Each structure stands twice: as C-alpha cells, then as structure tokens.
Amino acid sequence: QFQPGKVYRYSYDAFSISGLPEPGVNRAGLSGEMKIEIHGHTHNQATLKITQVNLKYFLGPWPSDSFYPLTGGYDHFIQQLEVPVRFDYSAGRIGDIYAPPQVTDTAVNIVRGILNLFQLSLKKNQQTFELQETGVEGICQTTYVVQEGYRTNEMAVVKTKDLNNCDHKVYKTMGTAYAERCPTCQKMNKNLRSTAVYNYAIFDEPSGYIIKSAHSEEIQQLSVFDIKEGNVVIESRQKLILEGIQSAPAASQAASLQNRGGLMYKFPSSAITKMSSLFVTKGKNLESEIHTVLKHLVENNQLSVHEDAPAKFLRLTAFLRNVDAGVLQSIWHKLHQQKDYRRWILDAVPAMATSEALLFLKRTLASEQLTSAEATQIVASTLSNQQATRESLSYARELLNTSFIRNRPILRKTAVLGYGSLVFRYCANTVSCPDELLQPLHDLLSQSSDRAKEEEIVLALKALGNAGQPNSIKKIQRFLPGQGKSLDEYSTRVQAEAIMALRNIAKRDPRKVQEIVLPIFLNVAIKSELRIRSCIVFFESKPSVALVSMVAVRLRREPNLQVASFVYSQMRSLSRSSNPEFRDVAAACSVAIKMLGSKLDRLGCRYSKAVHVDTFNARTMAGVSADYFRINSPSGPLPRAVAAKIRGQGMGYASDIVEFGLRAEGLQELLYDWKSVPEERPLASGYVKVHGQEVVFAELDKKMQEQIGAVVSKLEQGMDVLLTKGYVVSEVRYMQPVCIGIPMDLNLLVSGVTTNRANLSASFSSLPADMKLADLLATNIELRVAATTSMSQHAVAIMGLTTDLAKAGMQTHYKTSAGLGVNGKIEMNARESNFKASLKPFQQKTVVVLSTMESIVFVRDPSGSRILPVLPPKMTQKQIHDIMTARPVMRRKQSCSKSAALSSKVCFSARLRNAAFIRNALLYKITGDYVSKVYVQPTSSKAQITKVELELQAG
C-alpha cells in the first residue's frame, strides 16, 4: 500500500516493562522513541528508515514517568538502527526484510517490531474475522473487528492476538529437556498467558489501506503457581502516528538486498547461552574478565566460602560461554599446574554447556592432561549439561573414540550413557530424531551382540534407554522376551535391561511401548521378573482404562503369584493417587479393580509389590510422587530387585528427580547359526538415574603393609587438604520476543560453591617400628585437627527484557550460606574402646546459617546496574495500623535454645518484609526482603574446651 514515490513519516514510541501488576511497586524496563520514514517503491517493496532514536530505560513505580536516557555503549547500535531496511509489503502482508550484515539481528528484530504494526490482513467487506497470521511473535490466532470511524474513508480496526494459540510460536529454551508435559496439570492452570491487542485508525485509499495511527498493548503474564496466587507481568505498548505524507523525487533505491528472513523474530546465534540476563559481556575484554573472576574464586574461597562465590561462578560461566576452545586452551595452559585454578576451571567446564567446552574437553582428555578421577567427574558433568546442538553430538561421538576414555571402564561407561542423554536432549523438542545420532549406539549394540559380550549389550541397552528414541524400538526388540518362537540366546539380565530401556521411549510413544510390553506381561511362559518389569513399564506409560482392564481380567486366572501380587498391588496403590499427573491412570485402575476380588492383598513380604505415594498442592500447582518396587523370587526371601523413584510436578510439567535400583540374582543363587551369550552372573548390580537418565551403574561380581606406613608418616608430618567445588544446580531459561521486537527472558539459575579444608596432624607413642594396622588399632592415636566445611547457594529467578547491551526486569535472589568449624583434638584407642574429643568452643556470637532473599527491579548495561527494591522502602492500637497498611511492615522473629552443660545457646533470628499486605497470594509472600540467621553464642562462663568422651567395653 505504500505508493511508489511517496514518503510516509511516522513517530514511533514503544516500551516493555516487567514487574508485579500493582500500582506503587517498582518496575523496570526498556523503551525507545523514534521518527521513521517509509518510502514506497515499486514491486511491492518499501524502505523504512529510522531518522531519530532516543533509547530509554524505565525504573520506578508504574504508572509514572520514570523513563531515563540509556547513555553509554549504544552509538554503534544506534547507527545500525539508522541504516535503511527494505521490506516486501503487498496488500498489507510483510514478506521478507533486507538489511546489511553490519546491521545486527537485534537491530533487525527491533525493525520487525515496527513492521509488525503494518501487518493488516483486511478482508474487504467482512466486519469480523479471524485467521492464523504471521507477526514478530510467530503465526498465531488473530481476530479483527472492522468498524466505520466518523471522518469519511476512515475506519477503526482492532485486532487481537491469542499468543497461546499459535501455528508457530517463536521461542527458545534451555534446561527443559527432561520436563514432560502434564496435560492434566495444564488444563488446571496455564503458566504463561499472553495476548496482544492492536488498535488502528486507518484510511481506505485507492493505493491501499494506510495507517493514520496504531496503538498496541501486549501482556505476558507468568503464573508460577496457580493463576490466583500472584503473577509477574511484562506489559509492552507501541504508539505509531502518521505525521505526514510527501512526494519524493526521482528514485535510486538505497536499501540493501541482503535477505534477513520474514517478519517473525529471529534469535541471534547462540543467544540462549551467550546472552546472559545477569552479566553484560559484549564489548568487554573476555580473557581478562575471566582471569579476574577466576582469581577471585580461587583466592577467596580458601578457609571458607566467600558470600558471593556462587554469583562469581555464574559470572565466570557467562564469560566462558563467550570464548572459544582456543581461549579455553590458553587459560588452561597457564594454570593447569596450580592445583586450585585447575580445579576451578574443570568445574567451570560442564557449567558452560556449549560445544566449545566439550571440544576443549575432548582435546584435554586426548592429550592425557586429566587424571582418571577428574575425567570421570567432568565427562559426566559436561556431556549432560550440554545445550545440545549437532556440533555437541559430533564432539561427543569423537570422544567415545578417544583412547583415554576407551582404555578406562568407568569412564567409557559414563561417556556412552552421557552420549545417550545428549541424544535425548537434542531430540526432546523434535518430532523426529535424525537416525545418525543413534548410530554409534545401535552399532555398539550390534557389535556387542555379535561378540556375545553380555556387559557390553547391557551398557548399550542402558544408553539407548537414555537416548529414548522410538527409532530404537526395532533394535531393542531383538533382546526382549517373547519376540518370536523364542530363540533363547539372552540372559534374564539382558532381557530385563531391554525392557527397562523402553521407559524414556514411552514418554514420546506410549502406545508403541504398550503394544510391546502388554503381550510380554500377558505371556505366562515368561519369567516373573521380566513380566513384572513389563508391568512397571506399562503402568508408567499411562495406559487406558481398557488396557488396564485387560490386565485385571487376566489376573483372575494368573498362575504366577509373584506376577499377580505385583500387578494387583500396583493397581490398588495407583488407584488411590491424588496427584493430577496420575488422574487418568488412577481412574483406569479404579475401574479395573472392580473386576476381581481382593485376596492378593493378603500376600505378604515374600511377594512382589509396588507402592505409589504422592501429594499435590493446588495453590502452588506443584507436587511430588514416589514409587517403590520389590520384585521377589520363589527362590528365597532376598529380593531379586528393588527400585525406588521420586518425581516432581510443577508449572504443568513433570520430571523424574532420582531413581535407584538394585538387582541381586547371583547373590540369590548363592544364598539358596547362533551363539549364546555367556552370562556374567553378578552377585549384584545397581544403578542410579537422575531426571530419567542413567548416570552410573555398577556390578558386584567377584570383588566379594607399605600402603599404610606412608599415611601414618604423612599424618605425622601434618596434612592440609582443601576441596572446593563450584557448580550450577539448575538453570532453566525461556526466551521469547515481545511485540516490540526484543526478547523477554524468564531465567531460573541455582548455583553453589562448597569449600572444605582440613589440617590434620597425628601423634602416636611406642608404636612398633614395623607397625601394622593392628598395632595402630591398639595404640593411643592423637589427631590434632583444624577443619571447616562451608557452603553457599544462590537461587536467582528473573523475568525481564534482555539484549546484549541492556537488560531490564524483575529479579528475586535467594542466598543461603552455612558453615561450621572445628579446632581441637581427637584421641582414640580402638582396643581400650575409648574415644575423646577436645574442641575449643565458640568464643563469640558465630553465625552458622545465613539466609537472605531480595526482590529487586534492575536495569543493567556496560555502565553497570541501577537497582530498586520491588517494594519501595516507603509509600502509602498497634495491630490495626500494622495490618491496615498500604506499606510493607518489617516483621521479626527470634527463638533460642540454651545449653546448660555448655553455657551456649543456639538462636534463630529473622527479619521479614514482603508483599502479603498487598494481596493474599503465594508469590507476594515470597516477594520482598528477608534475612534469617541460625547462630551460636556464649554467655561468659568462658568455656576453655569442650570434651566428648565415650567408653564402651568392660570399663
């Protein structure tokens, strides 16, 4: 509609503000005000040129005019916004946008926010209509109402977008791969609800519809709990006003022809990891910043953890994410011989989560620079913390081919399970997993069956279990029980692992797993253990009423009582679930149970069982479920296997938290063209899964004095030991464009630093010179100790707007520091059965647990941070004025517990100031400020020492 030869001049103002939706509390956000010109060209293109831009941040109470200039570091960005942008526009639909490569995607996305207003899908004489319409946010459901205004030719159009009903939603996530959508929980409550409404005054002119003015309003409303328990909101608004239409002289189009894609927002490369919410890294000297914070962490957490150590670790990680594997290598090279720098750096690697970390790792392992112990801590951390991409998957594959890893069993095991987890995370968001990703693992399973190596088949099945892909089902089925006339060539152990390997698969294709495991369960010729496992798999896949009924009817005549006991107890137990995730299965079990008597509930402990317990809170919309399985054998009272799992539900998703299993077949057996696979009969085996992913398993087969004189010698000479650990406990991030074309960012980061130091010096007397352990166990061993164990954990939750150079929003920060010290003497004598500790007491008030919480709104850029508390310190007999308050009131608590024997007291102090005065809602109760202290204190009796002495035996 822009007429060739015509220049349309507009003023454009936009902002996006985050915070609690309450008048009076502080909010923060970003804003701009521009003048723009759009020149119409031929061939249904036009060029938009921004002619003046004033960038602002918002920091203050809303409504208010707390908008201020964003000052330094923006000149280059402003010059990029000012380059002409060509766009295709025909009958009101934006097509492709073209801007030079020096104009960054950030700058193009802000242009897409303006162009989004010009998307006008008007259908000539329909007053109200709807359609899936492309915008900067994606393609979503849009409804229009077209009315006649009062000037003539003029129309009022108003359109509204349901941003939760989209054929395509633009967004990026980190950290959510193991979360499984809980359909029931999502019908109870929706966590992020978004809508945008565009209001126009339009002129119907032969050239086509031209906008006289547009105003938008968009709300992104986050409910972390139920919707009535408080929300955090991002509200964005644009105002576009036509200021003039002018004839423009003889052309010579000046705009780029570099195609930057369509109107939908485009995430800058690697934005989800590189662009931090907390830290500005663009434009800084990276290697230098990394050096400074790395020095601070190493140097400041020597005797105890520095209060901010977890936040510096988060800083260190944010900077590392911005450097390649070459910079990593230059840093390692300078510090790998310093024990502490070394340790801090290898901790930082898994936390980076980028493919450059994994390349550095591959190179360090291959050049043999790490020990076995470090490699096993890290190979582990790194593979699984990856923000999986194709390069990640390649370096991970090359890693399985590394000799250093292959030559080491526990490490090869970890790397292969890890590769499976990495596949699962890459494939989690796709409809279809590319086959080549599973190739290393199907190849291992195929070569392990060809070599008839049972251990290797087990490892591959478990890893494919981790990878969780339906593409694996055909390869796994070869190892399952009952897949043909039986070609008994695999042990129960291998078959059991093949059945367990279907579990993550069932999260994506439960129907295809049910089809497999139901005939197995129903086959009365199959060993009990294997049927029971198929029943565990079946129930976790959330079967329908009819399927569960089929099982219950088959139980009326089940010949194996182990199998009957198990199934009957699983159904009875699940029928009592009160957790939404299990609602449908639990009702299926209700109905099924009516189909038989209750006599199997009389079977005792010699019989297999399953128990499900759970709990859900409707206000938090969060809950936890636990299960425990005991598979028994007729052979005896020791279980053939036991497992227990715990799972969590929240925000409409669920995840496994941790699961442990133990199997003990041999142990039992000792207490009471084809080529068969030789059965390694492990006395026992065990594994551990975290979020559904098997992270370690071990077997106990046939594992049923120079080494000590050295330690005593080491001990007599004195030992100083320090172990610190830096780590990211969880990091979840959701980013999505708001209508103005910058991304909103919801970020949960929990990191922690632990420091443990011990100085130990041992004394003995007439110890025989040819000392043995038994001589040690028979003397007076005096151990002098100076030891400290301390820990600090920070949880940061953010909702705001983020770009490389300016971030704004709301943040709640929870920090907890704990630490205890011990300086004294321990005197032991194993034969005299006497133990003795002489500890120096607390001399002064000593804080042992420090916990703070602070909710702020912030604007961060290279100039640094500007921060306000969410609850303004001040705004607007005893009881009344306190309760009937328009302001926050500091509350105070303080308990004690005196020790007479010790002349010392353990106190708990706390100061609370939150937002409950505003709304009776859970989020408002944890929003504000809080400081709590668990401390120990004297009195004056001046205890010199405090001795704990034990004496067993005859005296």
Partner 1 sequence: SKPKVVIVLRAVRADGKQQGLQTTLYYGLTSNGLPKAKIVAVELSDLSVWKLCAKFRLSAHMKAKAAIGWGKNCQQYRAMLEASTGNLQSHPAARVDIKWGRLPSSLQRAKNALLENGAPVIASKLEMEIMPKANQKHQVSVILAAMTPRRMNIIVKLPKVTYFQQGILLPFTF
Ligand X SMILES: CCCCCCCCCCCCCCCCCCCCC(=O)OC[C@H](COP(=O)(O)OCC[N+](C)(C)C)OC(=O)CCCCCCCCCCCCCCCCCCCC
Ligand Y SMILES: CCCCCCCCCCCCC[C@@H](CCCCCCCCC)CCCCCCCCCCC
Q: Which residues bind partner 1 (CB under 8 A)?
A: 569, 572-573, 576-577, 598, 601-602, 609, 611-613, 841, 900-903, 941-953, 955
Beta strands in 137-257 (DSSP E): 138-148, 154-169, 172-174, 180-181, 192-205, 208-222, 232-247
Specify the residue, 595 or 690, whose C-beta has the smaller distance to ligand X: 690
Q: Does the footprint of ligand Y cover residue 201 (CB under 6 A)? A: no
Cα radius of gyration rounded to whole Å, the chain: 33
Question: Residue 762 forms beta bridges with which residues?
Answer: 783
Specify the residue, 410 or 545, whose C-beta has the smaller distance to ligand Y: 410
Q: Does the footprint of ligand X cover residue 802 (CB under 6 A)? A: no
Contacts of 454 (CB under 8 A, 6+ apart): 491, 493, 494, 677, 678, 679, 680
Q: Which does 741 bind (CB under 5 to 8 A by kind): ligand X, partner 1, ligand Y, none?
A: none
For residue 140, the minimal CB distance to ligand Y (Å) is 38
Q: Which does 195 bind (CB under 5 to 8 A by kind): ligand X, ligand Y, partner 1, none?
A: none
When binding is defined by CB under 6 A, the residue of 327, 626, 662, 907 that contacts ligand X is: 626
Contacts of 139 (CB under 8 A, 6+ apart): 132, 133, 166, 167, 168, 264
For residue 841, the minimal CB distance to partner 1 (Å) is 7
Q: Does the footprint of ligand Y cover residue 816 (CB under 6 A)? A: yes
Q: Residue type at 132?
A: Q
Q: Which does 675 bind (CB under 5 to 8 A by kind): ligand Y, partner 1, ligand X, none?
A: none
When binding is defined by CB under 6 A, the residue of 286, 642, 690, 847 that contacts ligand Y is: 642
Specify the residue, 883 or 900, whose C-beta has the smaller distance to partner 1: 900
- Judged by CB under 6 A, which stretch of 138-146, 539-547, 642-650, 672-680 contacts ligand Y? 642-650
For residue 270, the minimal CB distance to ligand Y (Å) is 30
Ranges of H-type helices in 615-755: 665-671, 706-717
Q: Does the footprint of ligand Y cover residue 695 (CB under 6 A)? A: no
Q: Does the footprint of ligand X cover residue 798 (CB under 6 A)? A: yes
Q: Does the footprint of ligand X cover residue 399 (CB under 6 A)? A: no
Q: Does the footprint of ligand Y cover residue 760 (CB under 6 A)? A: no
When binding is defined by CB under 6 A, the residue of 68, 267, 653, 814 that contacts ligand Y is: 814
Specify the residue, 74 or 814, whose C-beta has the smaller distance to ligand Y: 814
Coil, strand or helix at 851? strand
- Judged by CB under 6 A, which stretch of 57-65, 74-82, 671-679, 787-795 contacts ligand X? 787-795
Q: Does the footprint of ligand X cover residue 752 (CB under 6 A)? A: yes
Query: Are 52 and 34 in contact, with CB atoms under 8 Å apart?
Result: yes
Query: Are 423 and 437 in contact, with CB atoms under 8 Å apart?
Result: yes
Query: Are 689 and 500 in contact, with CB atoms under 8 Å apart?
Result: no
The phi-psi region of residue 718 (left if phi > 0; otherwise alpha if psi is between -120 and 50; otherwise beta) is left
Half-sphere exposure of 110 (CA within 13 A, CB side): 28
Question: Residue 636 forms beta bridges with which residues?
Answer: 633
Specify the residue, 331 or 574, whose C-beta has the smaller distance to partner 1: 574
Q: Which of 628, 600, 630 is nearest to 614 (CA)?
A: 628
Query: Are 378 and 346 in contact, with CB atoms under 8 Å apart?
Result: yes
Q: Count of residues binding ligand Y (CB under 6 A)?
A: 21
For residue 223, the minimal CB distance to ligand Y (Å) is 22
When binding is defined by CB under 6 A, the residue of 466, 793, 802, 812 that contacts ligand Y is: 793
For residue 835, the minimal CB distance to ligand Y (Å) is 16
Count Cβ atoms below 10 Å from residue 567 Cβ, excluding itself: 27
- Judged by CB under 6 A, which stretch of 86-94, 110-118, 651-659, 675-683 contacts ligand X? 651-659
Specify the residue, 373 or 950, whose C-beta has the smaller distance to partner 1: 950
Q: Count of residues binding ligand X (CB under 6 A)?
A: 88
Q: Which of 904, 790, 784 is nearest to 842 (CA)?
A: 904
Specify the residue, 396 or 922, whose C-beta has the smaller distance to ligand X: 922
Specify the residue, 515 or 951, whose C-beta has the smaller distance to partner 1: 951
Count Cβ atoms below 10 Å from residue 431 Cβ, excluding itself: 6
> Residue 320 and residue 309: Cα distance in Å, rounded?
16
For residue 579, the minimal CB distance to partner 1 (Å) is 11
Phi, psi of 918 (to 5 degrees): -85, -40
Q: Does the footprint of ligand Y cover residue 595 (CB under 6 A)? A: no
Q: Which of 504, 501, 496 is nearest to 655 (CA)?
A: 504
- Judged by CB under 6 A, which stretch of 13-21, 40-48, 640-648, 939-947 contacts ligand Y? 640-648
Give the CA distances from residue 78 to residues 32, 111, 429, in Å, rounded to whole numbers and listed in that order: 11, 12, 36
Specify the residue, 338 or 429, whose C-beta has the smaller distance to ligand X: 429
DSSP assignment of 579-598: SGGGHHHHHHHHHHHTTS-S
Q: Which residues does a chain break follow in the chain (C to N more than 2.5 Å)?
A: 672, 704, 876
When binding is defined by CB under 6 A, the residue of 227, 327, 587, 644 that contacts ligand Y is: 644
The phi-psi region of residue 460 (left if phi > 0; otherwise alpha if psi is between -120 and 50; otherwise beta) is alpha
Q: Does the footprint of ligand Y cover residue 657 (CB under 6 A)? A: no
- Judged by CB under 6 A, which stretch of 234-242, 298-306, 474-482, 726-734 contacts ligand X? 726-734
- Judged by CB under 6 A, which stretch of 439-447, 702-710, 784-792, 909-917 contacts ligand X? 784-792
Q: Which parts of 415-454 interact with ligand X (CB under 6 A)? A: 417-418, 421, 428-429
Environment class of 628 (CB within 10 Å of its CB; exposed 0-12, middle 13-18, buried 19+)? middle
Q: Which parts of 224-283 interact with ligand X (CB under 6 A)? A: 224, 232
Contacts of 348 (CB under 8 A, 6+ apart): 294, 313, 316, 317, 320, 726
Q: Which does 936 bind (CB under 5 to 8 A by kind): partner 1, ligand X, ligand Y, none?
A: ligand Y
Which residue do the tokens 């010096």 mark? 761
Q: Does the footprint of ligand X cover residue 611 (CB under 6 A)? A: yes
Q: Which does 651 bind (CB under 5 to 8 A by kind): ligand X, partner 1, ligand Y, none?
A: ligand X
H/E stretch holding 351 reads helix 339-352
Give the CA distances from residue 58 to residues 81, 737, 859, 861, in Å, rounded to whole numbers and listed in that order: 20, 18, 8, 13
Which residues here bind ligand Y, judged by CB under 6 A? 642-644, 660, 662, 686-688, 696-698, 793, 795, 814, 816, 820, 848, 851, 906, 934, 936
